[PDB]
């Protein structure tokens, strides 16, 4: 009984989180009303990891929905699986955050955070043995970014020896709501460098290019992007939701993926990614070739520009585990110039028999690559282009922030980039 408390904050965080619970609920046999209707015992083996068991054999997600405006969470509550969430677990304000990190972190969010922690504390008190937390959010807005990182800071204070994990959507100018997204992302990244054990970096530009170039969607939507995040979130958590000795719990995964406390930002990947030739069976070689292909990766960073510190691959479906080892061992031995040589056996593989809905087999990719620095470089450059002229700062100084705090965030992330660079050589 190793439970995980899930939190989703802000517009992006709740829409992605919503689809995440829609995907895994299907995989575990839970219907929109919480009743189990699967046909395999593996579905219920580790069900308590993400679901509480209520009266009448009902399974309620261990999820807390947070936002500073009601809009998005009314959509969730009226969505496909809206009824499955605990009504008490909806914590929301009315003012909104106006895409402002300072409002989510210092003013509006500060007024609402205590009641959010009252719900977290209530979900933890009912855990037999809490593993840790996972948060879904974007870094470019105000609530998921500013208040999300405020939550992490207070969750770490009350639960200092638990694992804090996040799925973080990084902003890109090509898929942007406001020009202040670099400001909010730079402020959040430093919070994450300090207070998270694992952060899956998801770049909205990578998601866009995949839908356009690979999936051949003429006009992608946020919904289309969230479909990829769903599938990926379902993939990375397969180790936790089904029986297996590899990457068993959150702390074991961290110990094997994080050689240095601050370099805990991962590039996730998924395969297949097929356009509607969608019924063709996919061979193991093809799964492995695609899974490692940059085009199938979601941080929008070219791995051939850096080096993998550690890699974790999860294969789902009924396949040849022998043929899996051969193809994995084939990729490592064919490109050993992108794997650091001072971490023996830094490529681990795991197998799972239950495939995602509608697929014979699939593979998920989790890489701790030094190429992630390119993502932070983009953000830093965009940040500095505006900060050198103090553009749009009044939105933030109006909420009590000082220019000195921006200068620190700038330096803190430039240091983060330098730390990656020294390990790439």
């Amino acid at each position: 009984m190793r439970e995980i408390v899930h939190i989703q904050a802000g517009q992006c965080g709740n829409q992605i989180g919503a689809k995440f619970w829609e995907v895994i609920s299907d995989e575990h046999g839970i219907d929109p009303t919480g009743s189990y209707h699967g046909d395999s015992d593996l579905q219920l083996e580790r069900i308590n990891v993400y679901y509480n068991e209520a009266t009448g054999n009902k399974y309620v997600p261990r999820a807390i929905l947070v936002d500073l405006e009601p809009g998005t969470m009314d959509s969730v509550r009226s969505g496909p699986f809206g009824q499955i969430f605990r009504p008490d677990n909806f914590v929301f304000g009315q003012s909104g955050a106006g895409n402002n990190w300072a409002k989510g972190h210092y003013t509006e969010g500060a007024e609402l955070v205590d009641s959010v922690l009252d719900v977290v504390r209530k979900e933890s008190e009912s855990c037999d043995c809490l593993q840790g937390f996972q948060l879904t959010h974007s870094l470019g807005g105000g609530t998921g970014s500013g208040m999300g990182t405020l939550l992490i800071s207070k969750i770490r204070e009350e639960y200092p020896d638990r694992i804090m994990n996040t799925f973080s959507v990084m902003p890109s100018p090509k898929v942007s709501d406001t020009v202040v997204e670099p400001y909010n992302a730079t402020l959040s990244v430093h919070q994450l460098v300090e207070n998270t054990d694992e952060t899956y970096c998801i770049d909205n530009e990578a998601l866009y290019d995949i839908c356009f170039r690979t999936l051949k969607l003429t006009t992608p939507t946020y919904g289309d992007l969230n479909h990829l995040v769903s599938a990926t979130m379902s993939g990375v958590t397969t180790c936790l939701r089904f029986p297996g000795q590899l990457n068993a719990d959150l702390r074991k995964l961290a110990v094997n993926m994080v050689p240095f406390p601050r370099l805990h930002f991962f590039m996730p990947g998924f395969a297949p990614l097929t356009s509607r030739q969608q019924y063709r069976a996919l061979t193991v070689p093809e799964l492995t070739q695609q899974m490692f292909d940059s085009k199938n990766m979601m941080a929008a960073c070219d791995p051939r520009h850096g080096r993998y510190l550690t890699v974790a691959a999860i294969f789902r479906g009924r396949m040849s585990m022998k043929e899996v080892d051969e193809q994995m061992l084939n990729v490592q031995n064919k490109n050993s110039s992108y794997f650091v040589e001072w971490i023996p056996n830094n490529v681990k593989t795991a197998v799972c028999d239950i495939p995602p809905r509608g697929l014979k087999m699939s593979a998920t990719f989790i890489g701790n690559s030094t190429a992630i620095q390119e993502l932070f470089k983009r953000i830093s450059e965009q940040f500095t282009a505006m900060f050198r002229r103090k553009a749009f700062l009044h939105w933030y100084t109006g909420e009590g922030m000082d220019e000195m705090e921006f200068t620190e965030a700038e330096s803190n992330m430039n240091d983060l980039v330098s730390e990656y660079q020294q390990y790439q050589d």
Binding site: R156, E157, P160, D161
Partner: protein, 54 residues
């Protein structure tokens, strides 16, 4: 090639064949090691809370 110490019983036998002749920390000290590390953990957590309090 010599055989020595041939012992036989109902369930087996054993012998020796020679081919060629030749030519702690106390209980107190363990508690200190454990308590020393427990203190270093308490110190590191205090520095974290002190950092979070600032």
């Amino acid at each position: 090639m010599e055989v020595i110490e041939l012992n036989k019983c109902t369930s087996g036998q054993s012998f020796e064949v020679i081919l060629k002749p030749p030519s702690d920390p106390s209980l107190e000290e363990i508690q200190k090691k454990l308590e020393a590390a427990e203190e270093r953990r308490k110190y590191q957590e205090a520095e974290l809370l002190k950092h979070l309090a600032e």
